[PDB]
């Protein structure tokens, strides 16, 4: 029974090793909006007689 206690304690230490890590790479990334219409700024001004 004492040996079973000792062996189990050593096994727990051996299981404390770390396998790897995982993370998400997202810094520097932004979302894009979509502009539907082209912003023209032209207006036509004409005289009443059409001259």
């Amino acid at each position: 029974e004492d040996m079973a206690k000792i062996y189990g304690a050593v096994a727990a230490v051996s299981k404390n090793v770390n396998s790897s890590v995982t993370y998400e790479v997202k810094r520097g990334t932004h979302e894009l909006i979509k502009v539907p219409t082209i912003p023209h700024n032209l207006v036509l001004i004409q005289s009443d007689n059409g001259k």
Binding site: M3, A4, Y7, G8, V10, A11, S14, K15, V17, S19
Partner: protein, 50 residues
């Protein structure tokens, strides 16, 4: 066809960690299965017939 098989059980083994440390845990369980964990003397002399 006939075969003789010795059944000592199945013991899970984990990779990535020391096998010797795992074998220590299973050795005690195996000893209990065979009945040799505690001090003993065999008394099989009288198990016979003529």
């Amino acid at each position: 066809h006939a075969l003789i098989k010795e059944d000592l059980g199945q013991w899970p083994v984990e990779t990535g960690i020391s096998l010797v440390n795992q074998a220590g845990v299973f050795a005690v369980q195996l000893a209990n299965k065979l009945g040799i964990d505690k001090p003993f003397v065999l008394d099989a002399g009288s198990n016979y017939f003529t």
